[PDB]
């Protein structure tokens, strides 16, 4: 529910989309009352084309906030904060079992919606300790977590996550567990790693509740793309197409599945078509990192990797044809990967034959041992002098 705001706020942020995108982003805060969260989200971005207000930046986004939106924003943020003050006060005096637990709870849907950290830090923590219906506790801890993600503060988010971790096994509700997987994953992308995020994400696909989450169609497409950056072609490909995922969903996967399918088929020609369509639809609607490099780079090597494994020699003429991308472009894309050490092939362009070093036996490994060794040794020589003195 408040999760719907981050994905929309991603839309002006990413480089596949820009200016129009603010009008849609603006509509959601009036409707939900998420208004405080949106205002907060402008600061978090720190200018990548955002801030649709008549208050400031009227033509800079070429969209603006409405007058009703402004009065409602103020009304909603103040009401929640106002209630919070009195409930915090009244609650202490009476029963600790009942009164405080209820009072914090009453605030809590509203408190996350506004995204106000300060009021939240004290109120949220008190509820959890005292046992009641176990499913209820889990739901509540989730609202505390939503506030911290909005700012992109590392500290606040990590702090929030820990209370949930303790609680989840305690309740044991596997439906509720699945929610904790999504929050961690957003945060995991937030630092950098899609790789961590991917592992969590794959689990969430099984059992799904759309409460405190956006929608099930949005998430499945996210999960298959994030899985892919982490996982190689054999296992992910088999799960999405041959398994349940496309049949049940009733088609929203086609962009990401096409991208995996080409590798399986050994017709690279589809791979290159699939890249543009997946990039805009699936990957880039994200507040937490609309950063193509991890996705794109990992997929480009996976495509080459299988081709290199299957033959000791190839022609250029075959490579160029299969991909369909040009001779120069294929060389250029490769230049990064070989140099980085993702791959290890060469193209003798002028004679149009490609020689491939195989990944088999001690030799490929000897090359490898040395690579880890040089840096290790370098760190060692520094260490020997510093400790000794």
């Amino acid at each position: 529910m408040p999760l719907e705001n981050l994905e929309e706020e991603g839309l002006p942020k990413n480089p596949d989309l820009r200016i129009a995108q603010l009008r849609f982003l603006l509509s959601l805060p009036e409707h939900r009352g998420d208004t405080a969260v949106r205002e907060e989200l402008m600061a978090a971005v720190r200018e990548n084309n955002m801030a649709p207000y008549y208050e400031a930046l009227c033509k800079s986004l070429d969209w603006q906030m409405d007058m009703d939106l402004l009065s409602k924003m103020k009304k909603a943020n103040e009401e929640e904060l106002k209630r919070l003050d009195e409930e915090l006060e009244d609650a202490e005096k009476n029963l600790g079992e009942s009164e405080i637990r209820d009072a914090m709870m009453a605030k809590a849907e509203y408190l996350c919606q506004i995204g106000d950290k300060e009021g939240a830090l004290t109120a949220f923590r008190k509820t959890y300790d005292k046992t009641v219906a176990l499913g209820h506790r889990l739901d509540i801890v989730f609202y505390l977590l939503r506030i911290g993600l909005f700012y992109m503060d590392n500290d606040l988010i990590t702090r929030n996550t820990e209370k949930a971790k303790s609680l989840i096994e305690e309740g044991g509700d596997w439906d509720r567990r699945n929610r904790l997987k999504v929050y961690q994953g957003l945060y995991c992308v937030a630092i950098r790693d899609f790789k961590q995020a991917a592992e969590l994400f794959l689990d969430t696909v099984s059992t799904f509740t759309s409460y405190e989450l956006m929608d099930y169609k949005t998430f499945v497409t996210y999960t298959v793309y994030v899985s892919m950056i982490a996982l190689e072609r054999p296992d992910l490909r088999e799960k999405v197409i041959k398994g349940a995922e496309i049949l049940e969903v009733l088609h929203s996967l086609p962009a990401v599945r096409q991208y995996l399918f080409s590798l399986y088929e050994c017709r690279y020609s589809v791979f290159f078509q699939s890249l543009a369509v997946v990039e805009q639809e699936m990957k880039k609607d994200w507040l937490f990192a609309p950063h193509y490099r991890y996705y794109v780079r990992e997929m480009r090597i996976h495509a080459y990797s299988q081709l290199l494994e299957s033959y000791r020699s190839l022609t250029l003429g075959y490579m160029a044809e299969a991909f369909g991308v040009g001779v120069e472009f294929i060389d250029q894309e490769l230049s990064r990967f070989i140099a980085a050490g993702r791959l290890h092939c060469k193209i003798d362009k002028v004679n149009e034959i490609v020689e491939t070093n195989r990944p088999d036996s001690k030799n490929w490994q000897y090359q490898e041992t040395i690579k880890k060794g040089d840096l290790l040794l370098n760190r060692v020589q520094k260490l020997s002098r510093v400790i000794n003195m």
């Binding site: 480089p15 020609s269 290159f272 078509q273 543009a276 609309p290 490099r293 794109v296 160029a320 369909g324």
Partner: peptide
């Protein structure tokens, strides 16, 4: 190295052009 997405965008467009004419 890293921060590839920017150049990547340019790579994708040009590549398509080359991709249509050449492909089998």
């Amino acid at each position: 190295n890293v921060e590839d997405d920017f150049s990547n965008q340019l790579r994708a467009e040009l590549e398509k052009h080359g991709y249509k004419m050449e492909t089998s």
